[PDB]
Design a binder for this molecule. Sequence first.
Ligand SMILES: Nc1ncnc2c1ncn2[C@@H]1O[C@H](COP(=O)(O)O)[C@@H](O)[C@H]1O
Lengths: 104, 182, 178, 196
Amino acid sequence: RTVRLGRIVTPALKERRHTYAIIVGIIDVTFVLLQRKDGEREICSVANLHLEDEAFDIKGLSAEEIGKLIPEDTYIEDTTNDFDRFKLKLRKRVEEELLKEKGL
Amino acid sequence: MRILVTRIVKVPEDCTATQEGKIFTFQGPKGSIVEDCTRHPLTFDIHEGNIRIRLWNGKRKAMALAITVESLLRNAIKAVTVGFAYTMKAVYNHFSINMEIKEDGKILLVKNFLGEKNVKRFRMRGAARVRLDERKDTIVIEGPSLSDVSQSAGTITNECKAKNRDSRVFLDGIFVTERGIM
Amino acid sequence: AFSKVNMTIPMTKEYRIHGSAMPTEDNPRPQVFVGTIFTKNHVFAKAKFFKILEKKYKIKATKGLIIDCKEIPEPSFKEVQNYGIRFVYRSRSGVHNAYKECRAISKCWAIDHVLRELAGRQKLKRSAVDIISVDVVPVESLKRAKTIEFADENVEFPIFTKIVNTKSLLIPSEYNPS
Amino acid sequence: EKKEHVIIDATGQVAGKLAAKVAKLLLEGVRVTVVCAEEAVFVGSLERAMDKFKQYLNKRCLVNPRRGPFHFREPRMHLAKIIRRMISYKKPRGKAAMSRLATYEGIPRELEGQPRYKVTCAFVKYTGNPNRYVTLGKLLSMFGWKHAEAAKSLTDELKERESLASLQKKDLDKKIEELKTDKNFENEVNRRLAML
RNA sequence: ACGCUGCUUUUUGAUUCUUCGAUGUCGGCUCUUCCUAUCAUCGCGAAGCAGAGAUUGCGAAGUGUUGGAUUGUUCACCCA
RNA sequence: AUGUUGUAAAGCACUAAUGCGCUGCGUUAAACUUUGAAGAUGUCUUUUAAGUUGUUGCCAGUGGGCAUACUGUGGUAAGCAUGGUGUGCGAGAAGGGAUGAACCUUUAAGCGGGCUAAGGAGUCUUAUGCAAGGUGAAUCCGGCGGCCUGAUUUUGACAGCCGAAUUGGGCGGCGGAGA
Ligand SMILES: Nc1ncnc2c1ncn2[C@@H]1O[C@H](COP(=O)(O)O)[C@@H](O)[C@H]1O
């Protein structure tokens, strides 16, 4: 994978790796200019990025033609206070107590 | 500096290259060769049956290394297709220099050499055979490798030198006179 | 993607100043001067404006007047261009001139980037440098090869630095943290 | 009071950067064993590392060398001495911390199926000299260490029989998977679930 | 050559910080250890190096470096 | 508001020095001065600002000092000897500089709650990161996507027909000999 105009990127930590951005400018070997899904442009260094395997062409795309190519955020808020996640662990305990007498 | 630099090494008809993670293996109609490149920071691959080498953002010491690695690969290619063969000649003033072959061109003995009672003995490097040409006093060294043919000849020259006397008068030794082809 | 340290707001600022000598009744309505200064600090900019007038004319700060001081704001839209920066700097043994092109997103971001490169290559602080001018160079008046090559579109290259993708102290034995 | 235990693997780890972190674990009450102690590395050239070990050997009490400093040539004993000098070991709180450490060349037999860890900051590929280093086993073999071929053997025999144990485990994961997708299976378990 | 720049602590000066209810003050004999700025032995360069004999330089401190006449001598100077 | 001064620097008007060209060019001064600072030092006005002492009794210790920032004199020089202005140790703990009379912070151990200074944040040992370069003298040598100046070249340079850059002087950081 290469640095180029139109490459998709993601942050480096494996958590917080559910957001996206696109490259819209190259300053030197270390610094690029990004545009996030919301409209903001920012300067980041390539030691904080993780290059994805899809790229595009952006020639006349102004700011919104070029902002419809960013994928959407794949994050899910959570629930299940204490009783919701008690049942799921309850369902599995019976399997091993049965799966033991069946060997395996 | 540049953003990219590329070098190409042509692979002829008979040679058949092969690559297992930076290690290159050649096989022509004269033997095989293993040219290992695991320690260099460059990119290798075979493009249209040729060898390609690339370097991104190298300064000047990495660019000098990329051109020396390219010319060691074209030396390994023409070793297993044509081979190498060096020719040496012994010259003297008073004492005849007698030479012998012991194994199948693996050992070379050097007799009298300035009246010495000592007998010098040379062992050829791997995959190189010593022969005896017929001019009057001449040997030939041949094999499918430049590394071993040239190091076997350079040892013989370095070890016949007449210690502790004026080198402008005692001009005896064994020299290389023809770097050629098998 | 976030960087967690803001690199898009520069440390340098720009000010446009009008100044004069302090009026008297032997010299009422004196001459007015104007100029721009790149620095931090409203207060730092006024003192440098008077060191300028004091060395060409002989007007000092204790007998001078500041009439106006304006800070130019950053651009709202961001876009990479080419720049050229005239300056002089002080050495262990004298004063010298230099030119130094580069790429940036504004005039003050381009000065931050030139200072950032003189700190490793010549070991200068920031107070040893004076800026004479900053301007945008179109594409074909470029004097350096490094900017002509990056100013192209369809530029491409891989990167070879590593990446830390976790902030733990111990990782499992077969994990590849990069 | 603590009873935690950690096995640390040193294969591509800078020896000083690992020692400083292993010593902070010992002071906070954790038991550590370092295995494969001959595979830690030193950044640089072999000529630079031999010159530094040669100055170490020169230190010697002239009056009576039996009292004098002791120069260890085994990789497990030498790397244990680098961890000891990271801390104040004459005092009683430091004597206790050194009681919680063990070191080995290769991998011993008892620690065969247990998980190992690496230190995230001591990987040699984060420096600017990746591909210029010396292992602790090659440096020490040039000053007297004999058992360098018997250590590579013992580690590969354990790796191979730790890879077979992974094939038996993976196939049972597929035979148990089909049973969970059964007919008499579910109608049974739905009854045990029925009686809460 | 005429000029110019350094290092050591083996000379002899310059100084007076420590010791005057006391640190036994020259040399030899005996015995051990360290330095290299190497005299010999090992390896190797240069020449106005033909050979022989020497002269000049580099790596190198492992091992060696004596017996006598005259003087208390250190030192000096001769014999083998 | 109104008086006094002859140092630094500079200069040749006096005293004393110093090369040439036949009016100019060249070099000097603790015991030379035609000039001449920064700084010091007198007086008037609180009918200027800001702030808020006079007279006298009985008596002790002390009269070997030393350090330093800046600044002189003698000396080849000295952790040497001897002057000037301020501040310290002496008679000054505590925090920091690994260790230290004098260095930097700061002025003294009652019981609680908050915040900083000097100095620091891999580990001993309380506490985070971002970026650019990189991997003891005279006197010599190399390098850099650094900078300043010149010359040559697609009408084909430099190196030895080929097809694109070549090169002379300097400067500023960095490294190597001298060691
Ligand atoms: N500048 C470079 N240009 C070309 N190949 C490189 C460069 N730097 C490293 N490599 C090679 O690319 C690989 C680097 O990726 P990695 O081994 O994952 O660190 C190795 O195979 C190197 O030989």
